[PDB]
Structure 1
Amino acid sequence: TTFRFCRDCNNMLYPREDKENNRLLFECRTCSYVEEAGSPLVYRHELITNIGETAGVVQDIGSDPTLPRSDRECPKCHSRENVFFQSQQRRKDTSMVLFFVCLSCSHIFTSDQKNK
C-alpha cells in the first residue's frame, strides 16, 4: 500500500533492504535515488474488503433525482432529509446494508445494527 515515487526520476520506489544500518530503504531501479522506510509494513493483500461502500459520494448525491429519499435523522445534523442507497460494492456476497447521506451535513451513516 501507499506507493512511493522518485523525484527527478518519478518512477516508483521499490524497497531495497539496508542490512548495515539494518532498516528498509526505497530504491529507484532507474535513477539511483533513495530514502527511508516511513513504515516497516510493505504490502497488503486485502481479501475481504469494506471499501467502495460509499463509492463516489459526491457533494451532489443529493441532487440525483432517482435516488430514494428517506426521513431518518442524521446523528449529527438531526435533519431528516437524506438520500440512501445500497453498498456500491457490486459483488454477489455483498450484504444489503444501507448507507444514508444527509442532505445537510453530507454526513454518511448507515442503517446498520450489527456494527456501526
Structure 2
Amino acid sequence: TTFRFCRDCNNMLYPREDKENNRLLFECRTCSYVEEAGSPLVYRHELITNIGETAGVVQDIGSDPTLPRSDRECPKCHSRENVFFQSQQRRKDTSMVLFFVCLSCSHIFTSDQKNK
C-alpha cells in the first residue's frame, strides 16, 4: 500500500474526499500538508500471502554451514552449487517448496512446477 509521510513533521498522510476536483489527496493530520496520491489504492488486506517466503535472504547466506547443499541448475549463471531452504513463513498450510539460492550470483530460484 506504500504509506507516505509528511515531509515537515514526519507523520503519515491520510486520504481525503474533496468535491472541488474529486481527486485523491493525502493530508497530514498535524500541519495540513497536502499532496496528490499517486494511486487510487488506499487500503490493502491480503489474506493468502506469498510475501515472507524469500524473507531472510542476504548477501552471505552461503556462509551458513547449517544450510544444506544441492546441485541444481541456476538459470542465470548455470552453476552446479547452491543452498536451499523451505518457505520461511511459519503458517501451518505452507508447502515443501524449496528456494534454491545460487552462491555464484545470489539468484533465488524455486522448484515449484505448477507456477513454472
Q: TM-score, normalised by structure 2?
A: 0.96
After the TM superposition, which residues 68-79 of structure 1 pair with which residues of structure 2 at under 5 Å, given as runs? 68-79=68-79
Residue 18 of structure 1 and its aligned partner are, at CA, apart by: 2.1
Q: Which runs of 4+ in 1 moved over 2 A?
A: none
Residue 73 of structure 1 and its aligned partner are, at CA, apart by: 1.5
The equivalent residue for 1:84 is 84
Residue 51 of structure 1 and its aligned partner are, at CA, apart by: 1.0
Q: Gaps (5+ residues) in structure 1?
A: none
Instruction: Count matched residues.
Output: 116
Cα shift readout 1:13-56 (whole Å, capped 9, x = no counterpart): 01112221110101111111000010111110000000111111
**Structure 2 CA distance for aligned equivalents of residues 10 and 110 of structure 1:** 39
* Matched-pair identity in %: 100
Instruction: Report the aligned-residue RMSD.
Output: 0.8
Residue 60 of structure 1 and its aligned partner are, at CA, apart by: 0.8
Residue 61 of structure 1 and its aligned partner are, at CA, apart by: 0.7
Cα shift readout 1:61-102 (whole Å, capped 9, x = no counterpart): 100000000001101110111000000011101111000000
**Structure 2 CA distance for aligned equivalents of residues 79 and 105 of structure 1:** 9
